[PDB]
PDB file of N, CA and C in Angstrom:
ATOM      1  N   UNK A 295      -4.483 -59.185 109.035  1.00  0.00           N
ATOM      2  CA  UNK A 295      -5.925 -59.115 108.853  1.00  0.00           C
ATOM      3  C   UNK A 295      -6.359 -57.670 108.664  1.00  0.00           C
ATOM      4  N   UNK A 296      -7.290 -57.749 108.028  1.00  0.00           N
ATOM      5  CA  UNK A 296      -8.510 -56.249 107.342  1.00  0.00           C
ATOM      6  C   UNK A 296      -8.622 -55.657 109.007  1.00  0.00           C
ATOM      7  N   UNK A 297      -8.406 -54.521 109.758  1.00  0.00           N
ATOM      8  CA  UNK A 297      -9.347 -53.708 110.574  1.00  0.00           C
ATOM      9  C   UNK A 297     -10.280 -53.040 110.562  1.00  0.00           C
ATOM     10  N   UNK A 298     -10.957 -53.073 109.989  1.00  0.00           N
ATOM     11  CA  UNK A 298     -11.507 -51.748 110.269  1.00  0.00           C
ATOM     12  C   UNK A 298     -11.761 -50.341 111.185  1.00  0.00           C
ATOM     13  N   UNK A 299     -11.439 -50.574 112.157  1.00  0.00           N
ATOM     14  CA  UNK A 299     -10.934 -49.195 112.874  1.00  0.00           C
ATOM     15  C   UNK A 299      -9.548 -49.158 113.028  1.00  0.00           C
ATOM     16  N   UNK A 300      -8.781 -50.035 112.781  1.00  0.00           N
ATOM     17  CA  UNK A 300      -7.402 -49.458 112.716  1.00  0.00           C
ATOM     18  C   UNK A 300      -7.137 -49.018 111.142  1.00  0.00           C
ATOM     19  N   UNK A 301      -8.154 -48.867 110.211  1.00  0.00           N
ATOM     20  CA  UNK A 301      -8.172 -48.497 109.066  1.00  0.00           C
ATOM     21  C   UNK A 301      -9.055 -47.301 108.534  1.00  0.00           C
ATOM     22  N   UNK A 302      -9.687 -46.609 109.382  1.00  0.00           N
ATOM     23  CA  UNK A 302     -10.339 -45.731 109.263  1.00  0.00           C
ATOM     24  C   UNK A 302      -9.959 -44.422 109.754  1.00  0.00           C
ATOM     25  N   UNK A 303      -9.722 -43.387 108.831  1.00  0.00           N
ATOM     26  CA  UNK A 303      -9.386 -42.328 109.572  1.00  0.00           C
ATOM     27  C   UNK A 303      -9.809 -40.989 108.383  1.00  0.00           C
ATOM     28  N   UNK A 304      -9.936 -39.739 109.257  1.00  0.00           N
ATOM     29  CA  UNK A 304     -10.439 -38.623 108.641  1.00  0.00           C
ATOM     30  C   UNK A 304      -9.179 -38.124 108.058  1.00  0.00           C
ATOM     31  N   UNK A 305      -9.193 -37.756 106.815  1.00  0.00           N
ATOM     32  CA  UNK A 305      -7.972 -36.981 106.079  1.00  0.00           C
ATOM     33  C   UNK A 305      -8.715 -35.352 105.717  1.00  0.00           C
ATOM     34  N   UNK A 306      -7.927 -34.557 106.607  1.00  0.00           N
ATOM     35  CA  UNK A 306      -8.093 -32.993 106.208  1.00  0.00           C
ATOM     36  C   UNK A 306      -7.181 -32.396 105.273  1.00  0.00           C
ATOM     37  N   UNK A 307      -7.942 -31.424 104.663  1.00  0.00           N
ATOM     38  CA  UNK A 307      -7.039 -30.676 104.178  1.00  0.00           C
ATOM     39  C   UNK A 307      -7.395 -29.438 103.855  1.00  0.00           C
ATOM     40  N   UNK A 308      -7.557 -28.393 102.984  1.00  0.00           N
ATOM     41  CA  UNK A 308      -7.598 -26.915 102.513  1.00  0.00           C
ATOM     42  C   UNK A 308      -9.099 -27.763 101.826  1.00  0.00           C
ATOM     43  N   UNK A 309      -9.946 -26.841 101.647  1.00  0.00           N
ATOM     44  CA  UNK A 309     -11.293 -26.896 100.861  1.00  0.00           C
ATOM     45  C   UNK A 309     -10.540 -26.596  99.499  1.00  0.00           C
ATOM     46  N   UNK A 310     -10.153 -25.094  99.102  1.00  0.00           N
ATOM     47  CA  UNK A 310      -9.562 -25.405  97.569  1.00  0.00           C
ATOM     48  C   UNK A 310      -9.078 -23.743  98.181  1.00  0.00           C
ATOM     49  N   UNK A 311      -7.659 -23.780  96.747  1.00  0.00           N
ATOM     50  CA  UNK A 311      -6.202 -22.751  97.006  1.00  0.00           C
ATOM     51  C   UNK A 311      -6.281 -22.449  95.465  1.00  0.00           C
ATOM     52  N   UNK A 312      -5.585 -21.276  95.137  1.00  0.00           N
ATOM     53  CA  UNK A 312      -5.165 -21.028  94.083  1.00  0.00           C
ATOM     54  C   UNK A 312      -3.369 -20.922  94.280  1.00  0.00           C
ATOM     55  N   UNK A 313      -2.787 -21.872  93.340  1.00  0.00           N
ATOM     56  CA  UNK A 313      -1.327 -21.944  93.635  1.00  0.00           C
ATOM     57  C   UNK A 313      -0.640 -20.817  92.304  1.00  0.00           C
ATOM     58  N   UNK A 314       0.268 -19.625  92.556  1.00  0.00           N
ATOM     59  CA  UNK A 314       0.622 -18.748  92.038  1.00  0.00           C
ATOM     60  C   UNK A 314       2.158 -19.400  91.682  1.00  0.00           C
ATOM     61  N   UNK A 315       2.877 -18.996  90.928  1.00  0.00           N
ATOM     62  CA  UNK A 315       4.082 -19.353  90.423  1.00  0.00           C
ATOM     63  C   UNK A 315       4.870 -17.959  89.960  1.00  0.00           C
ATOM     64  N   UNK A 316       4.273 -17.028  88.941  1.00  0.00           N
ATOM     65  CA  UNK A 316       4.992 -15.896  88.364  1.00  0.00           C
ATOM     66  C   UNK A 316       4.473 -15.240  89.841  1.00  0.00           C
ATOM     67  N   UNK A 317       5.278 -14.635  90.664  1.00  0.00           N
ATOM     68  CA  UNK A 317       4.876 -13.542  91.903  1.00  0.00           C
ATOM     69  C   UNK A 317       4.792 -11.629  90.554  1.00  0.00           C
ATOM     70  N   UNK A 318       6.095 -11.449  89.997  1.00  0.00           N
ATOM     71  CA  UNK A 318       6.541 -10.343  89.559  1.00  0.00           C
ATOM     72  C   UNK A 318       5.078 -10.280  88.637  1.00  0.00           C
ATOM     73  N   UNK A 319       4.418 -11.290  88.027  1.00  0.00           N
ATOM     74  CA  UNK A 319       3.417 -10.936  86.816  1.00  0.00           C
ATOM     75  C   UNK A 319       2.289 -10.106  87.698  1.00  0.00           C
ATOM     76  N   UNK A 320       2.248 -10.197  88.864  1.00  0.00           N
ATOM     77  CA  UNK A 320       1.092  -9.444  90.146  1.00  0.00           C
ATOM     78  C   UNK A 320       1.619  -7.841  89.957  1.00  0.00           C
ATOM     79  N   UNK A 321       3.063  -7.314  89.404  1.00  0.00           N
ATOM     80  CA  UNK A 321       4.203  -6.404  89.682  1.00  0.00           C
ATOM     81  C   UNK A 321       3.391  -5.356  88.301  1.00  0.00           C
ATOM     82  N   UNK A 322       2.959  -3.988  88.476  1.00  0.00           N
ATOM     83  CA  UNK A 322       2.828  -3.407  87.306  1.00  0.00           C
ATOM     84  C   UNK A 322       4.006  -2.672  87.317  1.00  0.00           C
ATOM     85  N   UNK A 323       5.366  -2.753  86.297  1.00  0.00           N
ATOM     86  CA  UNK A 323       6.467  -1.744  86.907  1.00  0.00           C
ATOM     87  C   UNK A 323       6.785  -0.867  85.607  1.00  0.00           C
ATOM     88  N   UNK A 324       7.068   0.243  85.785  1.00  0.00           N
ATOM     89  CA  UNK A 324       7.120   1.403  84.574  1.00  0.00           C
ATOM     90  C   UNK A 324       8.409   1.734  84.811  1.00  0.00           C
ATOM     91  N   UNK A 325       8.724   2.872  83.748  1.00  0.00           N
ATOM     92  CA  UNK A 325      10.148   3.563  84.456  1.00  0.00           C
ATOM     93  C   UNK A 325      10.105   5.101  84.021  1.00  0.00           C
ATOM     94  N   UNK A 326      10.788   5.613  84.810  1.00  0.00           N
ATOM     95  CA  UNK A 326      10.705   7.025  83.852  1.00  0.00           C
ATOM     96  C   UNK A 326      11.118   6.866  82.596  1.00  0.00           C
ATOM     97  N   UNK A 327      10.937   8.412  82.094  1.00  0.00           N
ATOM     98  CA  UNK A 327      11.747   8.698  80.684  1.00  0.00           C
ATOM     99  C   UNK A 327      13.409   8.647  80.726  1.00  0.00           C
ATOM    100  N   UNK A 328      13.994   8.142  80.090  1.00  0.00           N
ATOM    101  CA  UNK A 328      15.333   8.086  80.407  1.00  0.00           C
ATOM    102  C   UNK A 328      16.455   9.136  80.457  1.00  0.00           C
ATOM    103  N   UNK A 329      15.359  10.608  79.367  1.00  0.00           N
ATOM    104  CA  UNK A 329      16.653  11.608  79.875  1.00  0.00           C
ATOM    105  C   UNK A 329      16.491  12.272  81.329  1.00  0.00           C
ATOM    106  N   UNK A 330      15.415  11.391  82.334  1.00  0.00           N
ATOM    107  CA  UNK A 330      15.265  11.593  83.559  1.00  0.00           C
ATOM    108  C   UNK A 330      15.712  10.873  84.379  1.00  0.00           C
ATOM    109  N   UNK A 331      16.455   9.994  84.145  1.00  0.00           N
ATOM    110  CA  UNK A 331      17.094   8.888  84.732  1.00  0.00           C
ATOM    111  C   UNK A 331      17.655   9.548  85.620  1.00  0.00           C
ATOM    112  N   UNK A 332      18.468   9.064  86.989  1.00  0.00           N
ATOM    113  CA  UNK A 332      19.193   9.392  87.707  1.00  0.00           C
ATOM    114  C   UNK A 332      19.696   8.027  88.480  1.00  0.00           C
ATOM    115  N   UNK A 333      21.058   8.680  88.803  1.00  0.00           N
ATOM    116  CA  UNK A 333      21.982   7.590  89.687  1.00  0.00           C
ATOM    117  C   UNK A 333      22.002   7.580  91.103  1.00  0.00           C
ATOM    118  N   UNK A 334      22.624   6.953  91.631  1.00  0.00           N
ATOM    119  CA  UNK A 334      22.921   6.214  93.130  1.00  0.00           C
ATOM    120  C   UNK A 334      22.370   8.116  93.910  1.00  0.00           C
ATOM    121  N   UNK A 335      23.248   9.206  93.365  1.00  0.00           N
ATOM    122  CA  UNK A 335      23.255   9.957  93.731  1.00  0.00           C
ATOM    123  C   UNK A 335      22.218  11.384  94.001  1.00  0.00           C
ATOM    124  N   UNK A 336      21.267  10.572  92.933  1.00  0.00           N
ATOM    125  CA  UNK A 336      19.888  11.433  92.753  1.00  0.00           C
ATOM    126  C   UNK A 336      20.477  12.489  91.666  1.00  0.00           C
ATOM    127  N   UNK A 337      21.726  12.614  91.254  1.00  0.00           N
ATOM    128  CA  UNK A 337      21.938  13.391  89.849  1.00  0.00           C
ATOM    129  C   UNK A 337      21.542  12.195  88.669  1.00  0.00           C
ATOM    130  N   UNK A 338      21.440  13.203  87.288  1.00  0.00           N
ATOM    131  CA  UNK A 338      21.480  12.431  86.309  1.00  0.00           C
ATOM    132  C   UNK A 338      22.479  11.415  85.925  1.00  0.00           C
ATOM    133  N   UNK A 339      21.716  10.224  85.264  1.00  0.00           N
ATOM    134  CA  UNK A 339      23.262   9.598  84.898  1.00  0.00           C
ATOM    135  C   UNK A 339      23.745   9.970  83.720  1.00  0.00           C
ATOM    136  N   UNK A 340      23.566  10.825  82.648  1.00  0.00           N
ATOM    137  CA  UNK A 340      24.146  11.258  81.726  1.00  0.00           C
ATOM    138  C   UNK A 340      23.286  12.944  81.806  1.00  0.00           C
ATOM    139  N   UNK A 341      24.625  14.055  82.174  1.00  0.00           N
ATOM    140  CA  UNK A 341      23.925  15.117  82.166  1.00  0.00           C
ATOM    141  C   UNK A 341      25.013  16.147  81.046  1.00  0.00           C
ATOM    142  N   UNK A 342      25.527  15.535  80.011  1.00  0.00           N
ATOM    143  CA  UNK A 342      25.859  16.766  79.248  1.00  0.00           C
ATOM    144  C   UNK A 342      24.848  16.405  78.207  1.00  0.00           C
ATOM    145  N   UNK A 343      23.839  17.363  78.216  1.00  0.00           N
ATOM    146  CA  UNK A 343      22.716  17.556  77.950  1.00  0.00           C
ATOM    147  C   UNK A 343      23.063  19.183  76.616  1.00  0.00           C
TER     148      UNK A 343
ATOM    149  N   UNK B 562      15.273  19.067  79.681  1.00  0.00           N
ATOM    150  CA  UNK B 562      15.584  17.824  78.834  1.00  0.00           C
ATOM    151  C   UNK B 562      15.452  18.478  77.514  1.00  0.00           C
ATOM    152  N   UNK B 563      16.458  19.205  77.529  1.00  0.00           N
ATOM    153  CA  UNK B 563      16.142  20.181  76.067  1.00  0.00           C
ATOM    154  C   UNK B 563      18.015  19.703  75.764  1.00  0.00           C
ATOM    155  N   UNK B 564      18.356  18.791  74.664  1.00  0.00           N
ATOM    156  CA  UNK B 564      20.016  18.658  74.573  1.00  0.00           C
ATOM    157  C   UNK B 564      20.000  20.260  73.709  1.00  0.00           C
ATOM    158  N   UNK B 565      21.445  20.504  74.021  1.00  0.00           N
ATOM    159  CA  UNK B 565      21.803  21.812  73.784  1.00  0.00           C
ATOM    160  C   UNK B 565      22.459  21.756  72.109  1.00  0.00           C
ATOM    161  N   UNK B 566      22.388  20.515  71.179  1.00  0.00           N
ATOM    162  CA  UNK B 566      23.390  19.996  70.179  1.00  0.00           C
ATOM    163  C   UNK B 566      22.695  21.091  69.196  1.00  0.00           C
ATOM    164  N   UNK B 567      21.818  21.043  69.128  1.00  0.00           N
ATOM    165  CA  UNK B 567      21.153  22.016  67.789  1.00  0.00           C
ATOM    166  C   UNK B 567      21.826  23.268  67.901  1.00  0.00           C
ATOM    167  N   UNK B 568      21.401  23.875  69.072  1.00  0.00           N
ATOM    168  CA  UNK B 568      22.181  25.572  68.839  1.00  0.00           C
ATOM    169  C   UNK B 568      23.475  25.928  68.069  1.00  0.00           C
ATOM    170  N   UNK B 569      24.458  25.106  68.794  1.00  0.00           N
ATOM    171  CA  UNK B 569      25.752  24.535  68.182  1.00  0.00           C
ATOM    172  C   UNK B 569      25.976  24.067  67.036  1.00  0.00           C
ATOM    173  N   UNK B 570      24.800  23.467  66.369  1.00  0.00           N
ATOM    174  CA  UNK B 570      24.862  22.743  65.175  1.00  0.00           C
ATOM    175  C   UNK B 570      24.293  24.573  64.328  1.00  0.00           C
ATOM    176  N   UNK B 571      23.671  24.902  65.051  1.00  0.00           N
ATOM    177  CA  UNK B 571      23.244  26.235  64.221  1.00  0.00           C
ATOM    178  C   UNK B 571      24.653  27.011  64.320  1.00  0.00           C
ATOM    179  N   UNK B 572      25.164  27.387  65.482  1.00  0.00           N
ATOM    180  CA  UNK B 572      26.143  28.024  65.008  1.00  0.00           C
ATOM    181  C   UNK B 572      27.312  27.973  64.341  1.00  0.00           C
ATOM    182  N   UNK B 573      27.782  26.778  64.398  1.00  0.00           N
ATOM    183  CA  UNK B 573      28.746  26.106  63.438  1.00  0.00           C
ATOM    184  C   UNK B 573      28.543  26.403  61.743  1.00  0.00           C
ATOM    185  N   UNK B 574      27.210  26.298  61.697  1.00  0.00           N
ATOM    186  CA  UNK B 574      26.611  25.786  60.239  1.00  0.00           C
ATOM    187  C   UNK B 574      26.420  27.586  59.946  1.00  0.00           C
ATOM    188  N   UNK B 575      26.408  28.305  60.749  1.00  0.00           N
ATOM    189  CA  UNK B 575      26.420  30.067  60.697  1.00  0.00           C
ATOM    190  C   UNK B 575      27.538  30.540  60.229  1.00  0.00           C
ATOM    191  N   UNK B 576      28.484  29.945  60.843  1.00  0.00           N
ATOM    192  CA  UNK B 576      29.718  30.314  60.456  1.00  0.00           C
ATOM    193  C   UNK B 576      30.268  30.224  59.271  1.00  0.00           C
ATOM    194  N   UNK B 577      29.448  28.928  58.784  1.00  0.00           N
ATOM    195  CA  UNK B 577      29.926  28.727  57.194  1.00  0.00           C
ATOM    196  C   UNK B 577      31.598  28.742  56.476  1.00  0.00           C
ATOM    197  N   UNK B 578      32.049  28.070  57.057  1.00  0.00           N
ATOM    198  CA  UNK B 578      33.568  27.541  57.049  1.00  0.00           C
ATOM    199  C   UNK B 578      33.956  25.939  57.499  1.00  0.00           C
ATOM    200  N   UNK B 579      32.634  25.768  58.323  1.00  0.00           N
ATOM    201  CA  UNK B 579      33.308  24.175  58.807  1.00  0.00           C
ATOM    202  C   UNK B 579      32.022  23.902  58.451  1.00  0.00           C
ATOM    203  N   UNK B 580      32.462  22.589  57.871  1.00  0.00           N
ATOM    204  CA  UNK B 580      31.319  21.359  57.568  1.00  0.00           C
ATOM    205  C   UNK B 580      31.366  20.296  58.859  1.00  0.00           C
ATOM    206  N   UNK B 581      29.385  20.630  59.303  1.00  0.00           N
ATOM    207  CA  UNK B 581      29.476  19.412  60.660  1.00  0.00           C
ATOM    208  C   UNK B 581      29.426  18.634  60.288  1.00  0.00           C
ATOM    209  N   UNK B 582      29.226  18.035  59.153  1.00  0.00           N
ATOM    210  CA  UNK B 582      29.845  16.381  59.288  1.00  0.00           C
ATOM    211  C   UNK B 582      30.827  16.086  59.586  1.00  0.00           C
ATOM    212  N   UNK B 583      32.044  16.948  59.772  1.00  0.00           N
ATOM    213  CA  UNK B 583      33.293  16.495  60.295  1.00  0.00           C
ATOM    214  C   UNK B 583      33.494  16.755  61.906  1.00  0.00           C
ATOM    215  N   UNK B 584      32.335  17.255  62.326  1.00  0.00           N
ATOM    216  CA  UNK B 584      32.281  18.426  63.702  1.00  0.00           C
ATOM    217  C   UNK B 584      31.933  16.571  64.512  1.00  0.00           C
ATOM    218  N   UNK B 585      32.343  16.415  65.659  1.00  0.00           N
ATOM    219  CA  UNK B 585      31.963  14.912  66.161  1.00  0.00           C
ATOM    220  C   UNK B 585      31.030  16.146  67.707  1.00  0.00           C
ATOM    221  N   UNK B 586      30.022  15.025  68.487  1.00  0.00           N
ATOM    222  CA  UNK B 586      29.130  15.885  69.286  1.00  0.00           C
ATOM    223  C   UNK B 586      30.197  16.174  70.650  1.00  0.00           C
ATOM    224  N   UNK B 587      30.785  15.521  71.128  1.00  0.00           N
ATOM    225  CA  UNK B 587      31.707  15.818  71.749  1.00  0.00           C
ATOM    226  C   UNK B 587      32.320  17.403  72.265  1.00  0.00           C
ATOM    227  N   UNK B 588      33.129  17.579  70.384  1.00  0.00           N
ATOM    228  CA  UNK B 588      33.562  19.031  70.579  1.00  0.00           C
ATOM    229  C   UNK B 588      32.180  20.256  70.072  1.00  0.00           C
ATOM    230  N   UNK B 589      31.451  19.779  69.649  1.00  0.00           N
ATOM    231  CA  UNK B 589      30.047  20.928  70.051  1.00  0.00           C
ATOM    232  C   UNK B 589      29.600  20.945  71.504  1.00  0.00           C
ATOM    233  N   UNK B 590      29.411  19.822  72.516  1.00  0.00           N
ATOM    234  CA  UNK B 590      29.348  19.983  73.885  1.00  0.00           C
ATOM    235  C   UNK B 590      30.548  20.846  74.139  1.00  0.00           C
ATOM    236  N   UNK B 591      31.343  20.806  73.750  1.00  0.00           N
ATOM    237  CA  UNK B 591      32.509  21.664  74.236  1.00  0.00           C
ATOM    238  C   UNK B 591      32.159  22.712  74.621  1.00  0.00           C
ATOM    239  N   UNK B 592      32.476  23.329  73.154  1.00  0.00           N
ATOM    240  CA  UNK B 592      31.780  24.668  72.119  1.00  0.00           C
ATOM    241  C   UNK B 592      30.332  24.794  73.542  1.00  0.00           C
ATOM    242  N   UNK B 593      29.747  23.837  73.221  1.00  0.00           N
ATOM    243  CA  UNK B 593      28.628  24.328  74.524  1.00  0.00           C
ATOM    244  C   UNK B 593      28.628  24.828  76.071  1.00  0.00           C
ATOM    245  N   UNK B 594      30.087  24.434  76.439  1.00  0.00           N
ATOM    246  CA  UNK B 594      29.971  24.518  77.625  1.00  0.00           C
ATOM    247  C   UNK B 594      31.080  26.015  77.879  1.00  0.00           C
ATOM    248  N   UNK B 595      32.269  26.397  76.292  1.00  0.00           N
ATOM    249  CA  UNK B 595      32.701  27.741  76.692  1.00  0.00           C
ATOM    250  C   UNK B 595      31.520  28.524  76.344  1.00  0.00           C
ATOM    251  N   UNK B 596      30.954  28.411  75.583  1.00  0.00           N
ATOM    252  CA  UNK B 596      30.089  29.645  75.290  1.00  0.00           C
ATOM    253  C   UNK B 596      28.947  30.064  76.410  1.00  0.00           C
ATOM    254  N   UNK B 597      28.917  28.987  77.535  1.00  0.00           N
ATOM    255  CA  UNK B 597      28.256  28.881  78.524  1.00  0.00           C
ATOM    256  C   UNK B 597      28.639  29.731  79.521  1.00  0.00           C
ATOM    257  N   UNK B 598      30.055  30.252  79.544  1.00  0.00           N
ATOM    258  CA  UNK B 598      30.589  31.063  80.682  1.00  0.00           C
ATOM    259  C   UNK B 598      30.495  32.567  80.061  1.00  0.00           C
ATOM    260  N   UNK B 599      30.171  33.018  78.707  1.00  0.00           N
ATOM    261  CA  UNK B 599      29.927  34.069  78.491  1.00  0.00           C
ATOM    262  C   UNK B 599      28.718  34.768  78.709  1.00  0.00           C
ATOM    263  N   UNK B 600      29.030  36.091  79.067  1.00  0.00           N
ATOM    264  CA  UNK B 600      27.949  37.035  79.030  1.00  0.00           C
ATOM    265  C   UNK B 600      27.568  37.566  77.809  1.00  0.00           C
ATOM    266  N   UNK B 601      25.717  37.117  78.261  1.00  0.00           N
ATOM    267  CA  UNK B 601      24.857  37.892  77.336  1.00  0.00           C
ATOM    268  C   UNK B 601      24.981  39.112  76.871  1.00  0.00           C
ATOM    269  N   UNK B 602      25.083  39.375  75.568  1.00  0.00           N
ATOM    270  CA  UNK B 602      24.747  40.836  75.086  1.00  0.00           C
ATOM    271  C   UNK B 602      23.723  41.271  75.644  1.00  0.00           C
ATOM    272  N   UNK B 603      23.967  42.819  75.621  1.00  0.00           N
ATOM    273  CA  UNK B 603      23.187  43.505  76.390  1.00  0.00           C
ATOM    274  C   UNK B 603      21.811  43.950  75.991  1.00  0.00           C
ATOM    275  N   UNK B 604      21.680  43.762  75.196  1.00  0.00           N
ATOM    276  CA  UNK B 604      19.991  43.841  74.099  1.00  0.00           C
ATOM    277  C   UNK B 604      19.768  42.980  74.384  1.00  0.00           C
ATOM    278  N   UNK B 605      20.318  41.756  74.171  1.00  0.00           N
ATOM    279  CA  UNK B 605      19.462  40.199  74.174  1.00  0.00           C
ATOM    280  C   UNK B 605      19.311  39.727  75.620  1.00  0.00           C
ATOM    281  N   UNK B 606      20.283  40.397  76.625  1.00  0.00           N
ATOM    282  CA  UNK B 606      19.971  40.347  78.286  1.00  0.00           C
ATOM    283  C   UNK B 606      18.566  40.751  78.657  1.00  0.00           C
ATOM    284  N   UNK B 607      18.858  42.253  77.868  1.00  0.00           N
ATOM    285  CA  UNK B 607      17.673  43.217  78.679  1.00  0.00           C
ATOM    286  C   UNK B 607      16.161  42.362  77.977  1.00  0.00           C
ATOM    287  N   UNK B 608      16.008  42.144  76.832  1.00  0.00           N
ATOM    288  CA  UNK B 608      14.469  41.447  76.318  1.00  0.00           C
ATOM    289  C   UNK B 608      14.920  40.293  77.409  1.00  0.00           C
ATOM    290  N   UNK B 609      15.747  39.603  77.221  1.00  0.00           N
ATOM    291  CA  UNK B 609      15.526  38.274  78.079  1.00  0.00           C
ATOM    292  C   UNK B 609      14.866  38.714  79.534  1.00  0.00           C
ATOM    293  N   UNK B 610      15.467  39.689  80.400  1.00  0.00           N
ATOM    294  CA  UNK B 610      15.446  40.113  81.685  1.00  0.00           C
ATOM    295  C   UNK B 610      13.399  40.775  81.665  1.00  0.00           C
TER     296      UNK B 610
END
């Protein structure tokens, strides 16, 4: 049989979300110039210049 | 960030006996790096100094 109070109930949830997917597109990333590059070591990685 | 290939390419091409198209950059870095252990003439020291 139909209840009605065993059929009634409050459903919550978030009022409203914005759902993100790309995280990195938030990312502005540059790089140096490359004859400024440098390695692991903080020297250049190509220095016969 | 100044490559050193031109000077070399000037002095090679000064010399006027070797054609750099046959010169590969390699042995001009060479060329760059003995001529690197020599001392400046002494006119071109003293304006430099």
């Amino acid at each position: 049989q139909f209840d009605f109070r065993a059929s009634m109930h409050m459903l919550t949830s978030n009022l409203t979300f914005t759902v993100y997917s790309d995280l990195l597109a938030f990312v502005s990333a540059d790089t140096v110039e490359p004859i400024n590059a440098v390695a692991f070591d903080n020297m250049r990685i190509m220095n016969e210049l | 960030q100044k490559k050193m290939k031109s000077i070399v390419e000037d002095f090679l091409k000064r010399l006027q006996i070797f054609d750099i198209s046959r010169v590969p950059d390699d042995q001009m870095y060479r060329l760059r790096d003995r001529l690197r252990l020599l001392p400046v003439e002494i006119r071109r020291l003293d304006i430099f100094n």
